[PDB]
Write a protein that binds this ligand. Structure first.
Ligand SMILES: CN1CCN(c2cccc(-c3cnn4c3N=CC(c3ccc(O)cc3)[C@@H]4N)c2)CC1
Length: 257
């Protein structure tokens, strides 16, 4: 997986944040890639490279594909390039805003498909939200930053804490399982149908927490199909055992229309 830095030309910076940068570049002259580079001192090379190791372990059409790593300073992780960047941002563009419910649900289904694979392999995401989904030129969706031992923020590698996607038992006890990812997925569905609106709009993180102690659930978003809302409400059942599998979520979303 290790390559000489010479095999890579970084062309254009796509973002910079607290822990490093992401660039568009070319690999072996012809392959368009994205390159995540570590800012020295942010974390150890091993902590950074764990993300690459997880992409080695889990390969799937709905998961972001690893091409290579460079393990001398600055450390690089090299992946496939996704023309439409992060789903959370794409949804806010002219093209994104004009997507039909049909196409949005196809995208939700692809995300449930990738999560169904993670579930079947007995991994967890822990960081599931529209920010961590990448979108290709043909609107195919790929899950990034899965299986990490840590919770990530959106400003680490671009200019911009994810309490709003976190299930109650994870807030209260630090219990993270595939069922807390199912919770996060229900929140992600609200992002998809509102063309990228922040969850619990006009609540701060502490207010969300106070509301969840009282059993609060977001209302049906404007224009959201009622059946899709009922799917959301299943993802948000208080007890993790009452939440559906991703296998089921995928099957419902795939055949939705
Ligand atoms: C016209 N478009 C051009 C591309 N733009 C854009 C903006 C921000 C990120 C991306 C973009 C495209 N691909 N990727 C991106 N961001 C992070 C990636 C990544 C890299 C390494 C890693 O370990 C995990 C994830 C990745 N593959 C693309 C969006 C607008």
């Amino acid at each position: 997986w290790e390559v000489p830095r010479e095999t890579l030309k970084l062309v254009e910076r796509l973002g910079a944040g607290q822990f490093g940068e992401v660039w568009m570049g070319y690999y072996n002259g012809h392959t368009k890639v994205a390159v995540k580079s570590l800012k020295q001192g942010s974390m150890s090379p091993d902590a950074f490279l764990a993300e690459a190791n997880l992409m080695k372990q889990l390969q799937h059409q709905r998961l972001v594909r690893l091409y290579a790593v460079v393990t001398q300073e600055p450390i690089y992780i090299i992946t496939e390039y996704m023309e439409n960047g992060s789903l959370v941002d794409f949804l806010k563009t002219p093209s994104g805003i004009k997507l039909t419910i049909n196409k949005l649900l196809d995208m939700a289904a692809q995300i449930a498909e990738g999560m169904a694979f993670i579930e079947e392999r007995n991994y967890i995401h822990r960081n599931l939200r529209a920010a961590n989904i990448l979108v290709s030129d043909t609107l195919s969706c790929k899950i990034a930053d899965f299986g990490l031992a840590r919770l990530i923020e959106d400003n680490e590698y671009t200019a911009r804490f994810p309490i709003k996607w976190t299930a109650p038992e994870a807030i209260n006890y630090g219990t993270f399982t595939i069922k807390s990812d199912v919770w996060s997925f229900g929140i992600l569905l609200t992002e998809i149908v509102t063309h990228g609106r922040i969850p619990y709009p006009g609540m701060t993180n502490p207010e969300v927490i106070q509301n969840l102690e009282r059993g609060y659930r977001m209302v049906r978003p404007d224009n959201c199909p009622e059946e899709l809302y009922q799917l959301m409400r299943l993802c948000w059942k208080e007890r993790p055992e009452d939440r559906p599998t991703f296998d089921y979520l995928r099957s419902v979303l795939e055949d939705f229309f």
